[PDB]
Amino acid sequence: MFFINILTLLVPILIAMAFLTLVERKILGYMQLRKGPNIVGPYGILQPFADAMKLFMKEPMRPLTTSMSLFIIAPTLSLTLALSLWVPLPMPHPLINLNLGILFILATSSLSVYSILWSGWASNSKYSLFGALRAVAQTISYEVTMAIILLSVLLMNGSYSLQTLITTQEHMWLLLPAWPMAMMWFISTLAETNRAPFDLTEGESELVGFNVEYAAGPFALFFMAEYTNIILMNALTTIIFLGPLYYINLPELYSTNFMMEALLLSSTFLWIRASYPRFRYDQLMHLLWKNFLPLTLALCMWHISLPIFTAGVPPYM
Amino acid sequence: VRPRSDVTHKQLSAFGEYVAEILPKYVQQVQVSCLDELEICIHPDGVIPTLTFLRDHTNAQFKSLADLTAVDVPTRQNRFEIVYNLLSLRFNSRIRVKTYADELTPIDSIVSVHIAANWYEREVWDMFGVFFFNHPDLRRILTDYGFEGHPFRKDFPLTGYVELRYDDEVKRVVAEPVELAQEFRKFDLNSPWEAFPA
Amino acid sequence: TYKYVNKKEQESEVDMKSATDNAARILMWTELIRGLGMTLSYLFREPATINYPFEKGPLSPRFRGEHALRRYPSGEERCIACKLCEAICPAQAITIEAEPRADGSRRTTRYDIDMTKCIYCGFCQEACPVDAIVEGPNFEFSTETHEELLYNKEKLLNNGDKWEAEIAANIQADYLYR
Amino acid sequence: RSRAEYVVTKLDDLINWARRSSLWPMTFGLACCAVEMMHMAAPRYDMDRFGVVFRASPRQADVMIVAGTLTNKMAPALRKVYDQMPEPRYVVSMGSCANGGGYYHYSYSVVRGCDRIVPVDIYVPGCPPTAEALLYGILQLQRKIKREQKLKIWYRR
Amino acid sequence: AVIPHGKGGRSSVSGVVATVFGATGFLGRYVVNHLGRMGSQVIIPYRCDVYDIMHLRLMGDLGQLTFLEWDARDKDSIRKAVQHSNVVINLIGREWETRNFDFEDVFVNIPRAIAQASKEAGVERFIHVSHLNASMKSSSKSLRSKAVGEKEVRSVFPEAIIIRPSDIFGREDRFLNHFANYRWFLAVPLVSLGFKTVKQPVYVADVSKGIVNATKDPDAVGKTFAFTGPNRYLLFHLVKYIFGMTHRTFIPYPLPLFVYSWIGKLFGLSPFEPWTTKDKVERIHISDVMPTDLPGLEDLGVQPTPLELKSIEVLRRHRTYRWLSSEIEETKPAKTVNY
Amino acid sequence: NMTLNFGPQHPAAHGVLRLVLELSGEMVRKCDPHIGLLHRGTEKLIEYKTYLQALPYFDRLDYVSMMCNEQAYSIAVEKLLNIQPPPRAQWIRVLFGEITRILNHIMAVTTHALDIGAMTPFFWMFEEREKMFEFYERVSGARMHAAYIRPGGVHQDLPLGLLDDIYEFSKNFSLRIDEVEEMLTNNRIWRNRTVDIGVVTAEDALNYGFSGVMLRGSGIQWDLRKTQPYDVYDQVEFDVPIGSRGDCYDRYLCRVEEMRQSLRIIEQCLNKMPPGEIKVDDAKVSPPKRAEMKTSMESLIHHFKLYTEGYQVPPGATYTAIEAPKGEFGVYLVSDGSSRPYRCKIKAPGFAHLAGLDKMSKGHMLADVVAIIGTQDIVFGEIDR
Amino acid sequence: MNLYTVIFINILLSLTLILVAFWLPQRLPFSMKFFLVAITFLLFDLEIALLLPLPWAIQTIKTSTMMIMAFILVTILSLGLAYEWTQKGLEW
Amino acid sequence: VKQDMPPPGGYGPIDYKRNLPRRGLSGYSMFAVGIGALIFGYW
Ligand SMILES: NC(=O)C1=CN([C@@H]2O[C@H](COP(=O)(O)OP(=O)(O)OC[C@H]3O[C@@H](n4cnc5c(N)ncnc54)[C@H](OP(=O)(O)O)[C@@H]3O)[C@@H](O)[C@H]2O)C=CC1
Ligand SMILES: COC1=C(OC)C(=O)C(CC=C(C)C)=C(C)C1=O
Ligand code: SF4
Ligand code: SF4
Numbered sequence A: 001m002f003f004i005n006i007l008t009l010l011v012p013i014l015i016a017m018a019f020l021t022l023v024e025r026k027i028l029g030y031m032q033l034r035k036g037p038n039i040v041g042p043y044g045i046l047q048p049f050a051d052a053m054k055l056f057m058k059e060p061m062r063p064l065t066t067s068m069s070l071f072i073i074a075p076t077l078s079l080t081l082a083l084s085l086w087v088p089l090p091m092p093h094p095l096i097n098l099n100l101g102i103l104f105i106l107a108t109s110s111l112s113v114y115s116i117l118w119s120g121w122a123s124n125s126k127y128s129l130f131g132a133l134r135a136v137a138q139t140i141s142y143e144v145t146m147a148i149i150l151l152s153v154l155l156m157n158g159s160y161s162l163q164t165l166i167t168t169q170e171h172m173w174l175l176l177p178a179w180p181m182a183m184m185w186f187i188s189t190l191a192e193t194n195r196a197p198f199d200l201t202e203g204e205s206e207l208v209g210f211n212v213e214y215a216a217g218p219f220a221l222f223f224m225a226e227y228t229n230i231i232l233m234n235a236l237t238t239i240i241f242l243g244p245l246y247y248i249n250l251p252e253l254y255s256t257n258f259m260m261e262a263l264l265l266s267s268t269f270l271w272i273r274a275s276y277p278r279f280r281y282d283q284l285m286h287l288l289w290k291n292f293l294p295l296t297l298a299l300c301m302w303h304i305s306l307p308i309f310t311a312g313v314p315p316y317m
Numbered sequence B: 001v002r003p004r005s006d007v008t009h010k011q012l013s014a015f016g017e018y019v020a021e022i023l024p025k026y027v028q029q030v031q032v033s034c035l036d037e038l039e040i041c042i043h044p045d046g047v048i049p050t051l052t053f054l055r056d057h058t059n060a061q062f063k064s065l066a067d068l069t070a071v072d073v074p075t076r077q078n079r080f081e082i083v084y085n086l087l088s089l090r091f092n093s094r095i096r097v098k099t100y101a102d103e104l105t106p107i108d109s110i111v112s113v114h115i116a117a118n119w120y121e122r123e124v125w126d127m128f129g130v131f132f133f134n135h136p137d138l139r140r141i142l143t144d145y146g147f148e149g150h151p152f153r154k155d156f157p158l159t160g161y162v163e164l165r166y167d168d169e170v171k172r173v174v175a176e177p178v179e180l181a182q183e184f185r186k187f188d189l190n191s192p193w194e195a196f197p198a
Numbered sequence C: 001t002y003k004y005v006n007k008k009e010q011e012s013e014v015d016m017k018s019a020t021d022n023a024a025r026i027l028m029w030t031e032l033i034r035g036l037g038m039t040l041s042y043l044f045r046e047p048a049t050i051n052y053p054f055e056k057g058p059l060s061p062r063f064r065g066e067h068a069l070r071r072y073p074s075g076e077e078r079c080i081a082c083k084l085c086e087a088i089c090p091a092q093a094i095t096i097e098a099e100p101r102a103d104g105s106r107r108t109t110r111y112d113i114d115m116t117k118c119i120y121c122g123f124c125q126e127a128c129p130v131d132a133i134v135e136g137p138n139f140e141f142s143t144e145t146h147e148e149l150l151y152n153k154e155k156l157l158n159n160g161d162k163w164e165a166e167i168a169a170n171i172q173a174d175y176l177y178r
Numbered sequence D: 001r002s003r004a005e006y007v008v009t010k011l012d013d014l015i016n017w018a019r020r021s022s023l024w025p026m027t028f029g030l031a032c033c034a035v036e037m038m039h040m041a042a043p044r045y046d047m048d049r050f051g052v053v054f055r056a057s058p059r060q061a062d063v064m065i066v067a068g069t070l071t072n073k074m075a076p077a078l079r080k081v082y083d084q085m086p087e088p089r090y091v092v093s094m095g096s097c098a099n100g101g102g103y104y105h106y107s108y109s110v111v112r113g114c115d116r117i118v119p120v121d122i123y124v125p126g127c128p129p130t131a132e133a134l135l136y137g138i139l140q141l142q143r144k145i146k147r148e149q150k151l152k153i154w155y156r157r
Numbered sequence E: 001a002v003i004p005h006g007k008g009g010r011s012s013v014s015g016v017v018a019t020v021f022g023a024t025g026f027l028g029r030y031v032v033n034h035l036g037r038m039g040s041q042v043i044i045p046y047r048c049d050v051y052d053i054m055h056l057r058l059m060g061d062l063g064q065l066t067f068l069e070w071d072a073r074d075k076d077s078i079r080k081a082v083q084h085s086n087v088v089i090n091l092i093g094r095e096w097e098t099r100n101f102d103f104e105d106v107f108v109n110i111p112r113a114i115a116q117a118s119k120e121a122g123v124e125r126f127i128h129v130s131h132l133n134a135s136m137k138s139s140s141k142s143l144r145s146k147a148v149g150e151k152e153v154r155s156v157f158p159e160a161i162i163i164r165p166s167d168i169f170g171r172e173d174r175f176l177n178h179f180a181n182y183r184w185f186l187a188v189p190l191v192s193l194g195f196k197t198v199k200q201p202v203y204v205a206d207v208s209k210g211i212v213n214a215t216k217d218p219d220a221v222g223k224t225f226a227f228t229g230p231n232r233y234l235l236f237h238l239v240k241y242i243f244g245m246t247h248r249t250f251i252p253y254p255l256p257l258f259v260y261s262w263i264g265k266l267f268g269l270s271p272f273e274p275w276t277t278k279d280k281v282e283r284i285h286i287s288d289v290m291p292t293d294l295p296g297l298e299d300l301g302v303q304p305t306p307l308e309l310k311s312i313e314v315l316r317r318h319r320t321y322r323w324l325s326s327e328i329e330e331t332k333p334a335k336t337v338n339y
Numbered sequence F: 001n002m003t004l005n006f007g008p009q010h011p012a013a014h015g016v017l018r019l020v021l022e023l024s025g026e027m028v029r030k031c032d033p034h035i036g037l038l039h040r041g042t043e044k045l046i047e048y049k050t051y052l053q054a055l056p057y058f059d060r061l062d063y064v065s066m067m068c069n070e071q072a073y074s075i076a077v078e079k080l081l082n083i084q085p086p087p088r089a090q091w092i093r094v095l096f097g098e099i100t101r102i103l104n105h106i107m108a109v110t111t112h113a114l115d116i117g118a119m120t121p122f123f124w125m126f127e128e129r130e131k132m133f134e135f136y137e138r139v140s141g142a143r144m145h146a147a148y149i150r151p152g153g154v155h156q157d158l159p160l161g162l163l164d165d166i167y168e169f170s171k172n173f174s175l176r177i178d179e180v181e182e183m184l185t186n187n188r189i190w191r192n193r194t195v196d197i198g199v200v201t202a203e204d205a206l207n208y209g210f211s212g213v214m215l216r217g218s219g220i221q222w223d224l225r226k227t228q229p230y231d232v233y234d235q236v237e238f239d240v241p242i243g244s245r246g247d248c249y250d251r252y253l254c255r256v257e258e259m260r261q262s263l264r265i266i267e268q269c270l271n272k273m274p275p276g277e278i279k280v281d282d283a284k285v286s287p288p289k290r291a292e293m294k295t296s297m298e299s300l301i302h303h304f305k306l307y308t309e310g311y312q313v314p315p316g317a318t319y320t321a322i323e324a325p326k327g328e329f330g331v332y333l334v335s336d337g338s339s340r341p342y343r344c345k346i347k348a349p350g351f352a353h354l355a356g357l358d359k360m361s362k363g364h365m366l367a368d369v370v371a372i373i374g375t376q377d378i379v380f381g382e383i384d385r
Numbered sequence G: 001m002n003l004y005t006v007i008f009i010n011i012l013l014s015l016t017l018i019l020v021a022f023w024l025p026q027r028l029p030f031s032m033k034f035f036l037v038a039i040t041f042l043l044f045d046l047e048i049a050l051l052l053p054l055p056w057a058i059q060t061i062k063t064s065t066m067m068i069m070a071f072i073l074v075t076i077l078s079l080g081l082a083y084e085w086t087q088k089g090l091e092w
Numbered sequence H: 001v002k003q004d005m006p007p008p009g010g011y012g013p014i015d016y017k018r019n020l021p022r023r024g025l026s027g028y029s030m031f032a033v034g035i036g037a038l039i040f041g042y043w
Helices: A002-031 A047-057 A073-084 A101-123 A126-155 A162-168 A179-192 A217-240 A252-275 A281-309 B006-022 B044-055 B117-128 C016-027 C030-043 C084-088 C123-127 C153-174 D004-021 D035-041 D075-084 D131-147 D150-155 E026-038 E050-056 E075-083 E103-121 E141-156 E175-183 E204-215 E235-246 E257-269 E278-284 E307-316 F042-048 F052-059 F066-080 F087-116 F120-140 F162-184 F188-194 F202-207 F213-217 F248-271 F297-308 F351-360 F366-374 F380-384 G002-023 G032-051 G054-058 G064-086 H027-042
Strands: B027-029 B064-072 B080-088 B093-098 B162-167 B172-177 C066-069 C094-100 C106-114 C133-136 D025-027 D063-067 D090-094 D122-124 E018-020 E042-046 E065-069 E087-090 E125-129 E161-163 F004-006 F019-024 F027-033 F316-323 F328-335 F343-347
Touching: A002 A047, A002 A073, A002 A217, A002 A252, A002 C030, A002 G002, A047 A217, A047 D004, A047 G002, A073 A101, A073 A217, A073 G002, A101 A126, A101 A162, A101 A217, A126 A179, A126 A281, A126 F004, A126 G032, A126 G054, A162 A217, A179 A217, A179 A252, A179 A281, A179 H027, A217 A252, A217 G002, A252 C030, A281 F188, A281 G054, A281 G064, B006 B044, B006 B093, B044 B080, B044 B093, B064 B117, B064 F316, B064 F328, B064 F343, B080 B117, B080 F328, B093 F316, B117 F351, B162 D075, B172 D075, C016 C030, C016 H027, C030 F120, C030 F162, C030 F188, C066 C153, C084 C094, C084 C123, C084 F297, C106 C153, C123 C133, C123 F297, C133 C153, D004 D131, D004 D150, D035 D063, D035 D131, D035 F120, D063 D075, D063 D131, D090 D131, D122 D131, E018 E026, E026 E042, E026 E050, E026 E204, E042 E050, E042 E075, E050 E065, E065 E075, E075 E103, E087 E103, E087 E204, E103 E125, E103 E141, E125 E141, E125 E204, E141 E161, E141 E278, E161 E204, E175 E235, E175 E307, E235 E307, E257 E278, F019 F366, F027 F351, F027 F366, F042 F052, F042 F343, F052 F066, F066 F087, F066 F316, F066 F328, F087 F120, F087 F162, F087 F188, F087 F248, F087 F366, F120 F162, F162 F248, F188 F248, F188 F366, F202 F213, F213 F248, F248 F366, F316 F343, F351 F366, F351 F380, G032 G064, G054 G064
Parallel strands: D025 D063, D063 D090, D090 D122, E018 E042, E018 E087, E042 E065, E087 E125, E125 E161
Antiparallel strands: B064 B080, B080 B093, B162 B172, C066 C133, C094 C106, F004 F019, F019 F027, F316 F328, F328 F343
16 A cells, blocks of 8 residues: 555656646747647647657767766666655655655755766766856755755744644745745745756756756656656645645645645746746856845844744744 | 939049058059049058058048958969958048058058958958968968868869768768869850940 | 937936835846736737648748749640750759750750759749749658759659649739739 | 567557657758748747757757758768767758758858768758748658668568 | 779769678678779668668769668569679678578578579679688588588679688777677686687778779689788787777686587577677687688788777777777787787 | 867857857856858859859848848949949838848847747747748748849839738837847846946947947947948938947847837838839840840840840949948959959958957856857858858 | 655666666866855855754743844854855855 | 839838836835735734
């Protein structure tokens, strides 16, 4: 039965991963006055499966100058961490509820920065190394504010367990309070998934770095990873800040609304991509260290003070 | 028949005399075409001096270099005819200063007078082979890295002498003497009858 | 007449109201939200794409497309080998050699348009006195092998016979203009 | 149906469909034919609909469309990019400049065709080969990819 | 015939219309290269899908290379291929007896039918290629079967040239790559510790040029040339040398062949192109025969090219980033054995 | 300095560009652009081709502004022949010249964004661009590479429905500029990527021979369309959009304004196009009409000679510059009395601009260089010629 | 264990893909800025640590000391940032 | 006689100037919205 549940979480998520790609190629399309992929299958539903098969069949190329492990470990790690982070998520019931759940999600995300570092060193070509170094920096920087923004949340939730927020948000979303950080969580979620406004990790016009030497099966695995993440981080926004209504008698309206909010915020980063030009490498770090980190550290203190003098210290457990 | 204003053919003509007078050491001929265009002609040594006077003279400011080109009249002893076309945004007029250079008698470079010429002078060396002294970095611009011969010279075959194909044996692109599958049909077009006195 | 773009006519001194409006613009990304609205708007517009095989992008009569050699209604090929179509071709594409046919008429023994050499200028359409060589409407003649693209008299005459009905309609529509 | 032959015919039909449906092209971008495809990528004749990627790096590209003249200075590169593309790979030569030398055939700086440099699968004709015309050529590549029977040949080899 | 006009390069004519049935091969690729360079008309019968023969298209010029669909079991396909050719070159061969084709077929059965038709057609000359040192009694079924063929084809086609090349040295060859690829194997077995099986490699091009020159020379009729090489080698130096350029450790450990023929049997069972072959193994330890015979290279006009000279290009792909820049001069040469 | 080349295949390299960059860290200290990857021999081939059969070559030098390019050759050859195009033809060349500047600017603004990372502006305008080519195709038969503007006059009269269709496109086009206007002109992300990048001072721009929006962007007031009015640019009213400071933003804003100003010029041309002939009536220069050559001997002789031999323009030389969308496009045509030219130096606004990349991209990141090439609107056909 | 079960399936799923992916088909880039960032990053990462126990420390009976401590930590690091800005650091 | 020409009286007028609309909520009012959310949310 546990395996059944393991399958129920991973298989559906992976399929959702696939169709996000399709949805990204139609919502971007209609925004740009074009139908998008509808000719393969009915309305393009078979389109995600089609290139998956093309990608796996095409010859995986191992560059003459390339490590053969820091090359194959990197996509395996990227898919493994991203699919793994869906293990401890309240929907509303988590598969493996962990008392220090949010620290698990923060730690597992942090490990993905390596895959970028390992792939860049493994390729042994200049475009890859330059891209990886800037990339690791972006990801790491957007971790420092990412973590502090969560610590502010937790202090108003009382615990690290993601399951507690379902009881914290039984009367109001944590967006109303703490909206200023939501925005800053959303922008940081956009950076950590290397999506558009912050896609310098792999700029195309700039260094066509992460998958330069990655084609076919390796390309796919990170690829899959990114999109699953795209969902996971959006889903974490939909639990931590937008709290779906929870009724203990019927648990699925929680998941039904979790479904609706996650899809809309997942739709939002698709909409962000088409709408904005990409930021400069330093313009990106200028935002986090200058614009956001002082806002986050100060609002972090406000969230240690709001509890005490408003006699609202949250109940542990 | 095009409309022609003689106001210009007079203005430009006068200027020509003015330039000539101011720079008599180098100006050999100064003509105005029937198309109202002035074309001071200078000894090759006057390249630096004549340009500078035009770039920096209150009564003749010719700030930008429209173009530097070299017609090649093979008959002419001095094969190339370096032509510099300049524009004066202040006086809304253009002038052309043209000099003569043979294959192995280099011309001075004007990169100092106008930095626009940094590239065009490299273009003239690559295509025609004229050399420009004091050029910051003269090196082929348009032709292939290993190209031998100056292409726009009238004595260079259009198709050229080398063409490229990929050879499997050597797994690398390889020049071979040009072998064309339909030679350029050289239609003779000149008519045996003249048009006017000109 | 000139026009300054990006020239600030004067120094509006900050007024709290102004400052707030601005600070709000930086803090709550107001203009960024403006941009998102524009793309959401089109998402709702009808897409302009056409089903390519089923629907075709419109081409009017002068479209040059693919070369064809026409024939008189009687059945006598129009070309009389004056060979100025060869003379005015910019790319040297058309190769024509001729000899007096048995009938005694002038005709081309070999007419070869190298389509890879041709740059579809449409001057040949222009130059022909009998208008034997025409720019036919078809643009879809992509070929697996390079040799197929080279076209001799028989392919062009066959191309002419296949598309004669539309070529005649197209020339009918545009001849007054020429 | 039951026959090791039928299973091997159906499965390539599957393998061929995947390659056919998702061709990620890589355009070098020489001369002007690249524009006449930027029009194919554009809304009147979307290519994505057909499963075509607007921009794909060489290592992730199934099809190379050579648009424009291949000069004798870009030849040594085209071959490199063709050589560095993943194995399943196809070339579409667009423009009379690329499939044959076109205007500029007799030039000393232009390779008379990309077929001399890279093996070419479909030749799309026209000075600016029309954008439908490229789309017909890409669709002709898809007809060529459907006909290929790699698994059948391995079975009866 | 076709009077030879031109300057000598592509887009020129040499007048050799030649069916070449096994062109897709490693040797083949080279044969079509020169034939195409010279300007000869080359008909390439092929069975593999068009995708795989694309590499042959750019070779040769337009309308100079023609590809025909052909099946070995179907006699009619061979019939039409040689219809309009005046030179037929046979390079049909394999190392692994495939499910539907036996060594006899690939070497003796098929290469007969082919020359047989060629005669019916009236082709001026047929060149048949069989492996070097091929006794009708040689151990490897392959070599013996090949020997069987060179005899037969002479009765189907008299005065048919029979070049008999040694194992070939070239990029994409086996002789050189096989050993270099033993890297995956931690240890590199070598029967008799790689001794007493002196081997003389021959560059592929030399072989190709030689073959081509045959097509355009009256001196070769019924000749059984033997393209051999510029220097012989005990398998030991060869193996190490290879590993030397590849810059990968060399660990020669002797392996009793009786057991090794079994290893060949193992990979041989592989469905997808067994990497080693029982018939291979024997061949590898089958000593190169001595050079007393109608000479090949040089005799046919090409001076052999030493192995060390081009080895760098063949073995480069097997090096690691660390050694990629390394050059031949840095490395040492192997030693020959006039024995 | 970690030398790295911006190799041709990369999308930001316009297909052919090998910018040898010296990366002092991510900051780039020197650029040595290696053009020549698309040199076709355009100017050595023209010497072997008659004046009409060399027109087509001029549609392929800058391949995004075809007709304005072929208006520079047409004006040159016309000068050397002391012939002037008929009144209707001159308006048609100005009508098609501004459709080309809208077409080039949609190319330059949207592809610049494609390089920076904004993808939607390209798709919205490119649909508006095929609407425009249709106008080329409906008047010449070629979507691009028309050959419509002939050395004397233009080739064929406008079809009877084109001016109504050009009104409907121009009527609704401005909203389309307004729409990318909102999506890419105030985005802090665009401004940051474009503002204060590649500033070029006024005197430096004149000295480097920039001569284009690059000249106007830094505040120098020069438009060959008003200063030296070619064709009818003396009878149409427009405002040159001079920018103030020179950052890549002011240059973008200028390009967006010129699209708007061109709609003002297109409006005037549709409102005031004269009834008349489209090509000069001298059979010696412009080919005789199809009916005339098939009924009058003097016309067949003139058609035969013009197509087979040529105009035989009188001996002379001229440099004629027109304001092509990129900048000043000029042809220095030297002519012997022969029907085929002797020299044709195509001045390319772009050979000068690309030279400026090293000076303009000073103290700038790898990413800034992508913007610097984008703001020069460089098409390598014109530079390589 | 339950987690172990999930994770090994997770690695298995990824190793399966790469394996099929490889089986079905049948020098001196340095800028102190980059190093400097990494450093700053840990100085901040360590601080994140000293700040992580704050959810448990909220419930501490003291409260006054808690906040007095936490506010001092956040303020002193932020000043570190302040000097990073003031100095060329953070100015890439 | 019949040639493609502007309609009699000329065509209508075409807009070229930017028509970007300055439509938005005033800044003070805007701040209040977010501030109010926080103020209430905290309570
Ligand atoms: N080291 C060497 O290479 C040596 C080779 N030789 C001889 O030279 C010849 C060429 O060798 P090489 O090129 O390496 O051989 P390959 O393994 O490269 O194959 C040669 C060609 O034969 C074709 N072929 C093989 N089996 C069949 C079949 N049953 N029906 C139809 N065609 C077939 C193949 O076509 P496809 O792949 O399409 O089936 C291939 O193109 C061989 O015959 C060999 O006996 C002699 C001495 C040394
Ligand atoms: C508009 O300027 C140019 C581009 O950049 C946006 C290019 O991408 C390209 C080529 C691009 C590809 C890959 C189609 C060309 C030719 C060009 O002119
Ligand atoms: S012009 Fe017309 S008629 Fe004269 S040859 Fe060319 S095609 Fe035949
Ligand atoms: S083919 Fe015609 S269009 Fe394509 S590049 Fe050569 S010239 Fe430009």
